[PDB]
Design a protein around this nucleic acid. Structure first.
Ligand code: NI
Length: 59
DNA sequence: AGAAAGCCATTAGAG
DNA sequence: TCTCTAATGGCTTTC
């Protein structure tokens, strides 16, 4: 139908690692992480969005 | 300015 | 099936 990719343990970890420092990302930083983890800039953008949403409800 | 990014409510797919 | 979360739509805000 649409499709969905599940993020590896490494990817989710590195992403959660970066989020510990910068809760928001500049465009250059997103391109870096994308290449580093073999993800799309768009996928990195959305991940930080969703992860930001969980951080608001918990706090 | 106006693309881009954010917020947000919501959907749905894979494990 | 059940749950987690990737992914979308539709506005508003940013820069
Ligand atoms: Ni405008």
């Amino acid at each position: 139908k649409r499709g969905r990719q599940t993020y590896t343990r490494y990817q989710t970890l590195e992403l959660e690692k970066e989020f510990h420092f910068n809760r928001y990302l500049t465009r250059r930083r997103r391109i870096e992480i994308a290449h580093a983890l073999s993800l799309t800039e768009r996928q990195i953008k959305i991940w930080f969005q969703n992860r930001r949403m969980k951080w608001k409800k918990e706090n």
